[PDB]
Amino acid sequence: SGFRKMAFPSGKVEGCMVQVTCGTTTLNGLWLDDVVYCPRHVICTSEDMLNPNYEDLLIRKSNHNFLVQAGNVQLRVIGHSMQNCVLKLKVDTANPKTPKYKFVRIQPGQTFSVLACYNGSPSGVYQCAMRPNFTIKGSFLNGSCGSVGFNIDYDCVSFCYMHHMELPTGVHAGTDLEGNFYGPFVDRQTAQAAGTDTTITVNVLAWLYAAVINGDRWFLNRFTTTLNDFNLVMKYNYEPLTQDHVDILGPLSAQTGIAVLDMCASLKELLQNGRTILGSALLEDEFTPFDVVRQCSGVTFQ
Amino acid sequence: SGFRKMAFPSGKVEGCMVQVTCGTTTLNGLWLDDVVYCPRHVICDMLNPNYEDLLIRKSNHNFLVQAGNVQLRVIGHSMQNCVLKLKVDTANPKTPKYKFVRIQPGQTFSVLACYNGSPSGVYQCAMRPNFTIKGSFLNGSCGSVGFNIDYDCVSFCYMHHMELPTGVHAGTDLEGNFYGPFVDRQTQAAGTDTTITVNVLAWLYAAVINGDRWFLNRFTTLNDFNLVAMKYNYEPLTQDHVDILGPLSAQTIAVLDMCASLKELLQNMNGTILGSALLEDEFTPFDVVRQCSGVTFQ
Numbered sequence A: 001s002g003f004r005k006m007a008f009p010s011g012k013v014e015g016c017m018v019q020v021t022c023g024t025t026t027l028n029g030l031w032l033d034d035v036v037y038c039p040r041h042v043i044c045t046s047e048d049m050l051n052p053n054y055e056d057l058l059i060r061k062s063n064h065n066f067l068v069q070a071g072n073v074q075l076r077v078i079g080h081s082m083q084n085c086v087l088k089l090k091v092d093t094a095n096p097k098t099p100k101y102k103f104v105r106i107q108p109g110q111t112f113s114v115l116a117c118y119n120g121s122p123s124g125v126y127q128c129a130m131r132p133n134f135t136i137k138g139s140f141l142n143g144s145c146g147s148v149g150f151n152i153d154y155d156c157v158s159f160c161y162m163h164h165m166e167l168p169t170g171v172h173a174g175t176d177l178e179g180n181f182y183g184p185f186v187d188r189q190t191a192q193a194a195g196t197d198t199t200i201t202v203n204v205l206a207w208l209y210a211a212v213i214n215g216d217r218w219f220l221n222r223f224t225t226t227l228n229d230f231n232l233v234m235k236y237n238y239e240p241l242t243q244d245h246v247d248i249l250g251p252l253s254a255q256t257g258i259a260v261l262d263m264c265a266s267l268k269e270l271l272q273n274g275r276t277i278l279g280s281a282l283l284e285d286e287f288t289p290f291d292v293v294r295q296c297s298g299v300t301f302q
Numbered sequence B: 001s002g003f004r005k006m007a008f009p010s011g012k013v014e015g016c017m018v019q020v021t022c023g024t025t026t027l028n029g030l031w032l033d034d035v036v037y038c039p040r041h042v043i044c045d046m047l048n049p050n051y052e053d054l055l056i057r058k059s060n061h062n063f064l065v066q067a068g069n070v071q072l073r074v075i076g077h078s079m080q081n082c083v084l085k086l087k088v089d090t091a092n093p094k095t096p097k098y099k100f101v102r103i104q105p106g107q108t109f110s111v112l113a114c115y116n117g118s119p120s121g122v123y124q125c126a127m128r129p130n131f132t133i134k135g136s137f138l139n140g141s142c143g144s145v146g147f148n149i150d151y152d153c154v155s156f157c158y159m160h161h162m163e164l165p166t167g168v169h170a171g172t173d174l175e176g177n178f179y180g181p182f183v184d185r186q187t188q189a190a191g192t193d194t195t196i197t198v199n200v201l202a203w204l205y206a207a208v209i210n211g212d213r214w215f216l217n218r219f220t221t222l223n224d225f226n227l228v229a230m231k232y233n234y235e236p237l238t239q240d241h242v243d244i245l246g247p248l249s250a251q252t253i254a255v256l257d258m259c260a261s262l263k264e265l266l267q268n269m270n271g272t273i274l275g276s277a278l279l280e281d282e283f284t285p286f287d288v289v290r291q292c293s294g295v296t297f298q
């Protein structure tokens, strides 16, 4: 029993973290096969970040201008190319610890594990969700460039995030492993602000489904709803519910017997009046239905 | 910068997880050097077992140890308290620098939940004052270990054993000594638990370092506060506690300087601190320094 924010084992990702240094800038890189991936602003300085011409700044760099270190051993850069906001450095040696991997772009509401690193060395690992405003509520200090977010299913690591910058409000922004930013953000020093954030309904519902499997049932009512009316009643800044969403909540709905619209109506009423569910006073929205099924893996009666 | 419940990198521990099978019982084991550590309940099947007789009536080939496909030949077996030690033919080449440490109530560690010798996830948790853990364990997670990483040395401090009726979990250190008055026998109940004040204070320091300061005031002392703390079930604060909070006080406000702010936060909470409305008590002072200074292991 028990329910905790569970991150994936980070060992497979640890074997790929390297240190990338260009000029006076040093950040983390992802060593997969014979290519090292790192944010492209490593070739920048503080003065260039006010209006950087990345293509022009990269032409003025050569292969040995990039120092890639895996522990103490140095990796010779034999090629460099740029893909969106990510810099790709081809090296002479293929990483022997390279796992089976994928580059995947995730959707708002999905969760993943972040391995915070500094100087190519792991500092910690934690779970977080891609917020609807395309930001992540993580924990990052200066030098966390190149720290990656990922999911591990079977023995294949699905890389889905590379950290880049901190927004004024304290949240973090980044790209996928193809260099494309999540949201309307850019890797340049300009006035940028995260848009208004919303609560992930499907994660709150899955988390409520968790609580039921898990002892807490005080919040259930004998009320149902439809799709539109509940999505309209969101005034409380809750993400609208979709048909694919109720199809993902299907397995949890069957295991418990409560339907999605039955819990949608129950969720309404924790909103109208809002003591602790699963030990927390706030409604948690960073637990996907898959996370609940993974930890609350019980039989479904049919 | 942000503050999250941060677990240690589990790579060094993943390389030590193995599967131990005895008869029909299967759990997880810790492969360090040429010894595999696992709960002695693998040798069962029993509600009140005499482990000493059950182990003498067992031989080396009665234990099936698997790392991946690879079978580890058991060339010796011994028992220390509630932990079983299995000598194997091959020393683990992935053995990291390690230490066996018994932690104290209130200290935190990372749990690598495993099933059938394969690591499933990692999460942080604290040793509650009642010597229990509020973790997440399913059937087959027996033998999963808790640990701390300092420099390149892994400090193993917990081995999961059982789930108590209230849903909370109990286990031993790596020497087989249970945490609390629990035994690997069928009935035991966790005693009354309290909140770890020194962790609540350190967590308040973390909020301060991160921008959240709405709760700070300009003034109380030890006696007064633990008078206010005993009723909210906050574990009493000691002088060693404020000396550990010293480094955080210098980096930033003193302990009692913040103690009054906590008194007021207990007395009456209208917002969330660090994004949570509840007072978090699973962050030790070292945990805050680790997350705000960006300490890297290895």
Ligand SMILES: *C1=CC(=O)c2c(O)ccc(O)c2C1=O
Residues within 6 Å of the ligand: B027, B039, B040, B041, B042, B140, B142, B143, B160, B161, B162, B184, B185
């Ligand atoms: C799994 C592991 C274990 O160690 C244990 C134990 O020590 C006593 C009773 C039970 O049921 C278990 C168990 O299921």
